[PDB]
Design a protein around this ligand. Structure first.
Ligand SMILES: [O-][O-]
Ligand SMILES: [O-][O-]
Ligand SMILES: [Mg+2]
Ligand SMILES: [Mg+2]
Ligand SMILES: [Mg+2]
Lengths: 117, 10, 116, 8
């Protein structure tokens, strides 16, 4: 459900940026990554990314685990439009199938495989 | 825009 | 154009400070004050202020002139969102009309009445 | 980052 990025910036400015950035960075996609509110995981220092389209979701997952400073014993799951995405998809394919009307892809993360309950 | 992107390497 | 306070703190890190300071200091507003690039006046040692809402822009002006050690023959002008604010407005009103999305009001200063 | 708290 609720991403803080959408509450922090007016839609009009997010969409205008989203349009620009797809032209300027043709091999990357703009992605917001935020902690699900009930997750018992550290927050990220940075939530706003330009991500190579060819990177798989699985590889992006390991990059985000590293940036959270998770220990190996900590579980982590992603949610995109309320579902856990496949690790083999590319970030470009996930973006194409899931970006919002501001041209951003929104990824939530949690230590449990349920979101927003 | 007011918040910078973190540009990840290709 | 660009405030260095905004390149140092991610929008998330300055907005965190902004939201938590509005509740803690309910009669003051958070204000960043920075020298315009081409200003021929001294740099200001501290950039971050909690300013009483009832203080007028003109009173704030006199405080800032003192903090940069201006002589009375030195001109100084403020710019907020590219406009020079009236001295009779309160800082609370100026904040209500001009704060950015991180809940900070940004004031640039210069010795000339043109910015950027 | 800390604030400079002004009086009225
Ligand atoms: O842009 O890559
Ligand atoms: O751009 O790399
Ligand atoms: Mg870190
Ligand atoms: Mg009062
Ligand atoms: Mg001094």
């Amino acid at each position: 459900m609720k991403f803080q990025y959408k509450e922090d910036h007016p839609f009009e400015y997010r969409k205008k940026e989203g349009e620009k950035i797809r032209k300027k960075y043709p091999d990357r996609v703009p992605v917001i990554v935020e902690k699900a509110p009930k997750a018992r995981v550290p927050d990220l220092d940075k939530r706003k990314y330009l991500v190579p389209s060819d990177l798989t979701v699985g590889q992006f997952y390991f990059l985000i685990r590293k940036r959270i400073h998770l220990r190996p014993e900590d579980a982590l799951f992603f949610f995109v439009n309320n579902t856990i995405p496949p690790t083999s998809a590319t970030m470009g394919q996930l973006y194409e199938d899931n970006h919002e009307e501001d041209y951003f892809l929104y990824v939530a993360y949690s230590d449990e495989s349920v979101y927003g309950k | 825009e007011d918040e910078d992107f973190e540009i990840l390497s290709l």
